[model samples]
Target: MVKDEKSKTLFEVEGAVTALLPAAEFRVKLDNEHEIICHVSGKVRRSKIRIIIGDRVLVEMSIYDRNAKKGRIIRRLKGTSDRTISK
Candidate 1:
């Protein structure tokens, strides 16, 4: 576990986007076989990063809220197909 500047423990995981939800939220299936709901981070939203279903993404989860199954989408990972539309 890594701590942020504010001393908050952060857990990072790689997951595949399973569903697109309303309000910029998404359902992600983690490699650990667990699913969680996550929203795009402000940085990702401001940059207009679009995440589609089946897209692999990196998520940052707060240790304090592990039981809540919520997290923030940090970045998108390259798929095996390697299609690049925009950043």
Candidate 2:
């Protein structure tokens, strides 16, 4: 038998939404596995500006923000996850 990683990192860093700016992106998978477009509560839309695509972000899966939204962009990734950076 095989087991999967619990994925209990308190927060998850998902891919950026390439459709729009590389700064505003979703944190959850949307229509397809290749895409991550989540629906923000009506209240969030009214309170905050629209999140663009391709934005590296951090999602608070355990709790919701002021608008009952789950995903959030806390920090942006400098490079690809699979790549290594020189110090």
Candidate 3:
């Protein structure tokens, strides 16, 4: 038997929105310094909320598919951008 979903296996990361794309997707720069184009999953898309540049967000990423780097935005930090970076 094979697993039907990867919801429990994939990892999560927090990042800031760097650019907004046309297809409800946003380019994010993760706290660890990796950049990825992540799509909005539930919150912002459902409630008609806006995610501006620099808005922090929680993302879901794959471990083995490093080249893909494609992620999904599971949650947004409600304009909290200060916590993702360190001085």
Best by lDDT: 1
How many residue pairs in model 2 have overlapping backbones? Answer: 4
TM-scores for all predictions: 0.67, 0.31, 0.59
- Those runs of model 2 whose alpha carbons end farther than 4 Å from true positions after fitting are 1-9, 18-52, 63-69, 79-87
Q: Lowest-scoring 10 consecutive residues by lDDT in candidate 3?
A: 1-10
- Candidate lDDT values, in order: 0.71, 0.43, 0.67
* Candidate with maximal TM-score: 1
TM-score of 1: 0.67
Model 3: per-residue Cα lDDT over 1-87, one tens digit each: 122244446777777878787887788886677778887554455576666776677777666764246776755655656786774
Candidate 1: which stretches are off by over 4 Å? 1-8, 66-68, 78-87
lDDT of 2 by residue, 9-80 (tens): 344545544453344444444434654444443335546645555555444442334323444444344456
- Cα lDDT for residue 38, candidate 3: 84
CA RMSD for every model? 6.2, 10.9, 6.5
TM-score for predicted model 2 compared with the true structure: 0.31
| Candidate 3 local lDDT, residue 75 | 52
